[PDB]
Write an enzyme that holds these catalytic residues in place. Structure first.
Site, PDB file in Angstrom:
ATOM      1  N   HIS B  40     -93.138  40.303 -19.295  1.00 49.65           N
ATOM      2  CA  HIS B  40     -92.985  39.718 -17.981  1.00 49.65           C
ATOM      3  C   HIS B  40     -91.850  40.406 -17.232  1.00 49.65           C
ATOM      4  O   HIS B  40     -91.588  40.101 -16.072  1.00 49.65           O
ATOM      5  CB  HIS B  40     -92.748  38.200 -18.063  1.00 49.65           C
ATOM      6  CG  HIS B  40     -91.364  37.810 -18.480  1.00 49.65           C
ATOM      7  ND1 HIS B  40     -91.034  37.529 -19.790  1.00 49.65           N
ATOM      8  CD2 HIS B  40     -90.235  37.620 -17.758  1.00 49.65           C
ATOM      9  CE1 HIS B  40     -89.760  37.177 -19.856  1.00 49.65           C
ATOM     10  NE2 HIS B  40     -89.254  37.224 -18.636  1.00 49.65           N
ATOM     11  N   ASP B  84     -95.742  38.337 -24.970  1.00 49.66           N
ATOM     12  CA  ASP B  84     -94.694  38.730 -24.040  1.00 49.66           C
ATOM     13  C   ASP B  84     -93.779  39.786 -24.657  1.00 49.66           C
ATOM     14  O   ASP B  84     -92.671  39.492 -25.110  1.00 49.66           O
ATOM     15  CB  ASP B  84     -93.896  37.484 -23.639  1.00 49.66           C
ATOM     16  CG  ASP B  84     -92.966  37.723 -22.469  1.00 49.66           C
ATOM     17  OD1 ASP B  84     -93.202  38.662 -21.680  1.00 49.66           O
ATOM     18  OD2 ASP B  84     -92.000  36.945 -22.316  1.00 49.66           O
ATOM     19  N   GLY B 175     -82.229  35.193 -16.710  1.00 43.35           N
ATOM     20  CA  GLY B 175     -81.474  36.430 -16.688  1.00 43.35           C
ATOM     21  C   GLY B 175     -81.323  37.038 -18.069  1.00 43.35           C
ATOM     22  O   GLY B 175     -80.901  38.184 -18.194  1.00 43.35           O
ATOM     23  N   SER B 177     -83.963  37.074 -20.242  1.00 45.95           N
ATOM     24  CA  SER B 177     -85.304  37.576 -20.555  1.00 45.95           C
ATOM     25  C   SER B 177     -85.342  39.026 -21.043  1.00 45.95           C
ATOM     26  O   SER B 177     -84.580  39.863 -20.578  1.00 45.95           O
ATOM     27  CB  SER B 177     -86.200  37.447 -19.320  1.00 45.95           C
ATOM     28  OG  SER B 177     -86.962  36.261 -19.397  1.00 45.95           O
ATOM     29  N   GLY B 178     -86.263  39.320 -21.956  1.00 46.06           N
ATOM     30  CA  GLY B 178     -86.372  40.666 -22.487  1.00 46.06           C
ATOM     31  C   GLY B 178     -85.284  40.965 -23.504  1.00 46.06           C
ATOM     32  O   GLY B 178     -85.390  41.918 -24.279  1.00 46.06           O
TER      33      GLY B 178
END
Ligand SMILES: [Ca+2]
Lengths: 175, 223
Positions: B40, B84, B175, B177-178
């Site tokens: 995402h 994801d 913030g 994420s990943g």
């Protein structure tokens, strides 16, 4: 450089507050609540009659832990300042005498009952304007094959509802 | 990261920041040429920044490298949040040193209870935001599947696992994420999603890296 952008070219913050206005300075103004039909309190989501009001600040949230809102991501929309009688400020779609309608609930809703929306950008005018889709959880793959529109009832309440050819265009403006 | 602590400059050598004019997601360096992040978090023209602490200003140890290939897992479903994960190939090898180092992949899934290290530059506050200039750290345990599923009924696939506290109060946030979820020295997860942040009964949900290892190793060998 992603999708959701407000009325300032600025990116939309996941979990931030915005005013959802119309593309055309007609119809109505911002979004807010109203007590329609036989509701005990403001449980109906409508577009302000006042075509100049910014309505209620609306929180736009994605389940993803990103500061922005991912592309093609389902989102939940809820009032920053709910009516109190609602168990949650998050919108949901329920069967009403006028068909599936956008309403608040007195019962606490699960994630899958509120994350039923998704935005659709309109390159026309290039201005940041989006159509609001309504997605229903079919089977291991939801279907966003419906839009949200307006239903001017008896008393003139511009109710947000599920329609097929009466989609709503909105411009998100930070609040 | 909500309820964590300042990691310390370059104390999480494998943590990366994906930049597109500004920081938008974290990632994990797995070797000199590849970075693992969230699907995402896909964006065209991503610049990978290694050796970061204060993401707002240059401190002498950063390495800014453009991405040449961004490969989103074929089965990514932005609706259901499933699969994801995204692989990024740097168009230039990274100089591996003490401040910039790769994190090894898990060749076996971690069990519930294992303590993990989650990091990022995301929101640190509740019902309000406050983004840190420097990297925040957080120690959280992997939760059991039954508990994960009871917290998120109908939403947990086999490619996700919960980490954190049912009690709430500590968790990853917008913030992050990943970003990386490292347990026992291996990248077991990827900061994926959650309902709110550090809320009660709503722990962070992370991409279960162990299911994607064979694919990651395959992709790296042919791209
Ligand atoms: Ca820096």
């Amino acid at each position: 450089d992603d999708d959701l952008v407000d009325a300032e070219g600025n990116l939309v913050e996941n979990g931030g507050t915005y005013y959802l206005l119309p593309h055309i300075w007609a119809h109505g103004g911002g979004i807010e609540t109203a007590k329609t039909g036989n509701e005990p309190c403001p449980l109906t989501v409508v577009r302000s009659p006042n075509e100049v009001s910014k309505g209620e600040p609306i929180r736009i949230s994605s389940q993803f832990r990103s500061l922005f809102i991912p592309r093609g991501s389902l989102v939940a929309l809820g009032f920053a300042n709910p009516p109190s009688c609602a168990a949650s400020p998050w919108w949901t779609v329920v069967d009403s005498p006028q068909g599936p309608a956008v309403k608040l609930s007195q019962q606490k809703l699960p994630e899958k009952d509120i994350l039923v929306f998704k935005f659709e950008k309109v390159s026309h005018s290039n201005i940041h304007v989006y159509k609001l889709l309504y997605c229903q959880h079919d089977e291991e793959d939801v279907k966003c094959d419906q839009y949200i529109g307006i239903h001017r009832d008896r008393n003139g309440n511009r109710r947000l509802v599920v329609t097929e050819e009466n989609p709503l265009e909105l411009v998100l403006l930070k609040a | 990261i909500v309820g964590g602590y300042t990691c310390g400059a370059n104390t999480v050598p494998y943590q990366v920041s994906l930049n597109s004019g500004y920081h938008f997601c974290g990632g994990s360096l797995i070797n000199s040429q590849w970075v693992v992040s969230a699907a995402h978090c896909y964006k065209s023209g991503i610049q990978v920044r290694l050796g970061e602490d204060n993401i707002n200003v240059v401190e002498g140890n950063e390495q800014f490298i453009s991405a040449s290939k961004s490969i989103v897992h074929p089965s990514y479903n932005s609706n259901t949040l499933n699969n994801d994960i995204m692989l990024i190939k740097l168009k230039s090898a990274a100089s591996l040193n003490s401040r910039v180092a790769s994190v090894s992949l898990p060749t076996s899934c971690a069990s519930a209870g294992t303590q993990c290290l989650i990091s990022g530059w995301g929101n640190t506050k509740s019902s309000g935001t406050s983004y840190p200039d420097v990297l925040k750290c957080l120690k959280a345990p992997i939760l059991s599947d039954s508990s994960c599923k009871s917290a998120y009924p109908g939403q947990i696939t086999s490619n996700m696992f919960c980490a954190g506290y049912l009690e709430g109060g500590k968790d990853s946030c917008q913030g992050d994420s990943g970003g990386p979820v490292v347990c026992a020295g291996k990248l077991q997860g990827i900061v994926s999603w959650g309902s709110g942040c550090a809320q009660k009964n709503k722990p962070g949900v992370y991409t279960k890296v162990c299911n994607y290892v064979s694919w990651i190793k395959q992709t790296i060998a042919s791209n």
